[PDB]
Symmetry: D2
Subunit: 56 residues, 4 copies
Amino acid sequence: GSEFAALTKELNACREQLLEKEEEISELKAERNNTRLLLEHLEALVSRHERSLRMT
Amino acid sequence: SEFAALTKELNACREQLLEKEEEISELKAERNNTRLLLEHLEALVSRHERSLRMTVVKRQ
Amino acid sequence: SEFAALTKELNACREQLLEKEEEISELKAERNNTRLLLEHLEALVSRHERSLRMT
Amino acid sequence: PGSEFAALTKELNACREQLLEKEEEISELKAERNNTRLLLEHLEALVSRHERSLRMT
């Protein structure tokens, strides 16, 4: 019975670290979306101006 | 068989733990590739802006 | 008749000279608008690059 | 007559010299303009290629 408790304390500890890892993942995927959005604006800005210089 | 069921869940949780830290590793590596691009983009833009900034002073 | 020919070419030379000055003015205007974009591109890129630094 | 024609010729010649000078500055501006366009071509290619890569990993 005392071993079941110790085994539970380890699983719970592993569950805590799992969420800590996923919180790290979630923030990384968030940073990626910020990049994707930046790259969208950059591509739009350069293409718009490239066409202007090319077609005048 | 609660002990057995607990050990299996504990095992599966540790598998997902390695699984999640590998994704962190891949995202961090992917993040570094982004930084290298941004470094390069800032370089090309600043270098060209520099050429324009000097041309106005030179051609004057 | 030679004077008349010389004056016409002189007038035409000034007419084309005005066109070039107008072209230069447009080119320098377009150039300045280009620098504005570049400064904006550098600003956006440098900012997001600062967000993606390690610790 | 000969003095008048010569002086008018000098004026036309002066206009011609300034015309080619203006054309030289134009050709330089247009060259710089081509440099910028090429940069934007590489920038566009880079950001789009990287955008497509982030939409997979």
